[PDB]
Design a protein around this ligand. Sequence first.
Ligand SMILES: CC(C)=CCC/C(C)=C/CC/C(C)=C\CC/C(C)=C/CC/C(C)=C/CC/C(C)=C/CC/C(C)=C\CC/C(C)=C\CC/C(C)=C/CC1=C(C)C(=O)c2ccccc2C1=O
Ligand code: HEC
Ligand code: HEC
Ligand SMILES: [Cu+2]
Lengths: 185, 283, 139, 218
Amino acid sequence: LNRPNMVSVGTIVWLSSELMFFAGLFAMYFTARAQAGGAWPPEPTELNLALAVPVTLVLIASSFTCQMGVFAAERGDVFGLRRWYVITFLMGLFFVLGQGYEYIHLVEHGTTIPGSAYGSVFYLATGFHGLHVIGGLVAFVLLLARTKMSKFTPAQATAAIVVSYYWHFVDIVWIALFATIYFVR
Amino acid sequence: WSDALALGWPTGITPEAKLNRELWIGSVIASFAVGAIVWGLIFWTSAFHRKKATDTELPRQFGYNMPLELTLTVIPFLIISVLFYFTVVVQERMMHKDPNPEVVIDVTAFQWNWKFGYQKIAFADGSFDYDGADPERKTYLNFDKIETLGTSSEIPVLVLPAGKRIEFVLNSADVIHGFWVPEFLFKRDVLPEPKANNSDNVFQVSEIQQTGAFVGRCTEMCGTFHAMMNFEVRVVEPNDFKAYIDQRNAGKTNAEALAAINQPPLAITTEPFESRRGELVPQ
Amino acid sequence: MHIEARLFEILTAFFALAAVVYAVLTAMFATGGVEWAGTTALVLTTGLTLITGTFFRFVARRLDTRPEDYEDAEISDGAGELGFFAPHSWWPILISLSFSTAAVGAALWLPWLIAAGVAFVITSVCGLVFEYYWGPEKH
Amino acid sequence: SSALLRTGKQLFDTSCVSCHGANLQGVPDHGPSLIGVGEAAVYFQVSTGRMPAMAPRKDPIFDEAQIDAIGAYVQANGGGPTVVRNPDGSIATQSLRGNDLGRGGDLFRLNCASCHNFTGKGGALSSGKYAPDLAPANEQQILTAMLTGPQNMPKFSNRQLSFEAKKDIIAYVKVATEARQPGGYLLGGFGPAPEGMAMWIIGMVAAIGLALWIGARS
Ligand SMILES: CC(C)=CCC/C(C)=C/CC/C(C)=C\CC/C(C)=C/CC/C(C)=C/CC/C(C)=C/CC/C(C)=C\CC/C(C)=C\CC/C(C)=C/CC1=C(C)C(=O)c2ccccc2C1=O
Ligand code: HEC
Ligand code: HEC
Ligand SMILES: [Cu+2]
């Protein structure tokens, strides 16, 4: 029975809704850029492309690690699943820490949320994505803990798969945000 | 006879208002026709009651009449296309903005009152080259020399000439307001930063046929006393208008400048009712 | 699953057409140029429909006909054993109470209440996720 | 100067004249008299964003030298308290801070703590209104508020509370709102209500969790 997977359908449609949420955020950002004429990144702001690219590379690497974990999960092997998902969790935590460090260095040199119109849209566009990353990390921890406490079944496999493409959605959203904020300007 | 088919629309004091009223009456007649036909169909089909003589024979169970679907989907396209054509025509004929008006009023809306400016007068007869102030704009609001300011005890009155091209430039100090004079059959929102919000805060009327007093309301949501932002428009002849402008250039209030040309100095259409608190109030 | 994919594909086509038309017609003939809000909204609505329709198409392209996708199917064809459907549970109301606590702490700016609500949300979601997987107690 | 100040008040058709009148005698409908308060009342009411209104603290509209103008205008109509300036032209920041702390704390507990708190937190008053937290308040703002006595707050004249005592109280407040706590996490600055809540939600939860782990259930 169960020719298509039901948790998969649910996760896909919910990911679509979250795409609409990020649509709202992108609209907020794209407006008020057309109002800043000239040096539209204002008085004190300078983005650090020497630190923005490594964290993106780590995020893509984590996506690849998660896909490898999915491959390990499709065959009834739980230990490879665990290894690859621990690696993915660590890479994601490193991304989050790098983003926080960039936040600190950017806030102690000017740009703040109540300081300018650019700081507000920048911080809201990136912080909600960071929150989604933290949610994905929590999901990873819960999935691993659940694998520890019962026999490995196709339901466990399905859980791994749906968590994986949630992570992939987060990664593609970050790619869009990065391309929009650091290159297009 | 057409006073009933206008559903309460006041007869306009402006040619664009007259055109709008014609379009409105035509559309209302069309909608009444369609609604009457549909009501007739429903009330007719409500005579197909179950007859007691009807045996154990259900109705014809037909369903799925295919060409009727195409017919009833092709006619409403016709009606809506005709209405859209005429709507586009009238809405282009309602926002014209010729470059050479005769009077330019600067309307400013703030928290629960109005302020009018008299920016420029330039009559086509050849006369009345008036001007504005701009020594103090130090950033989007407009300041002039002859300004009519309303208060909670006196309602602002905007004196305008009859039969002249008038232009309005709308600006708000804090929040969104609305500029509705019902006799114009037209209204527009008053925005804080109209340029940074890509809005056209400028609109013109060709002439005002009648004379006298007309009311004006706010049509936004502004806060507590949103229902207490009324104003009045007084339309006089260009001679009374030159008399008023001169009596105002000589330092005089709006009420005195109005009493100088034999006009009631206070608003006769609406009255400056107190900022009320209730009926049982301890006054 | 042909009709689901076809529905979402029709929606995607219409949304993409509307998006591109609105984008170019605001690039021209507009008081300030591109509108930049409705354009983004329509583009990402098209993206939503595209994601869902593409997933459904990929699922349908590698699946045998189901008893509910085939007329002349019999009710004895679906005979078998369906999935697992949860009986009674009290974790949803606790999740809702935790989320409401965090929401009240965000409405009235109280960071201690926000943190307590977040911790309660984590705890109750853990309880919901582990409910049918805890083993017997090890004594 | 006083000329742009009159324009500051008069041409502020949105802000000033509708509530108080161009005579500054006070419109009976909207606003009080406003004839005897000096530049101190203006500097407190406007720089804290409480003035021109439609009453929590907000960000001020007028910033650049059009506050001191309106203050000089209000003062020129009728005398009153003035803003304390450093002998350079600016408004005093460090010079307003006193050196005596015990006296400042005694006077704070006697005259001020009854409404706000021991350490400057907020307080609850009757029928709605409250007393605010004193952490976001500036030092000239403390001085001017204590001089003018805003809504429901008593007016502490300079003849009943000397300027030296006011400086000591300012010092005590700025030290009580900026000092680290040598005990751990500050639980809000109130008494044992946060402490009892923390006990119930942290300590007792940890204890009952340890009991659930160690003991058996059946
Ligand atoms: C069981 C019953 C009380 C026996 C009655 C027998 C008979 C009727 C005696 C007559 C007495 C009648 C007439 C008067 C009653 C009042 C009187 C007896 C009070 C004396 C004190 C004493 C008896 C307390 C009663 C028992 C006590 C309240 C137990 C409640 C807690 C138990 C049941 C488990 C709670 C589990 C706990 C770890 C999780 C809850 C976490 C938090 C929300 C607890 C709630 C909570 C509490 C309990 C606080 O005390 C508190 C104090 C300050 C700030 C906040 C809180 C707070 O949030
Ligand atoms: C009608 C709204 C309103 C507006 C707008 C307004 N005032 Fe007020 N003002 C009041 C009221 C009412 C009070 C009394 C304080 C209270 O009720 O809490 C007050 C109090 C004051 C006080 C303190 C009075 C005292 O005795 O210490 C000052 C100073 C003041 N206003 C100045 C101004 C100035 C200057 C402007 C123009 C920039 C202005 N206000 C605009 C209504 C207003
Ligand atoms: C309960 C009566 C009461 C007393 C006594 C009192 N306060 Fe106030 N205080 C208030 C109220 C009410 C306000 C709010 C003023 C307003 O909203 O306009 C206030 C406002 C203030 C502010 C303004 C804070 C801000 O951020 O705007 C300061 C500073 C202040 N008080 C200091 C003091 C000092 C120092 C003392 C002791 C000399 C004191 N207060 C005594 C009730 C009181
Ligand atoms: Cu209004």
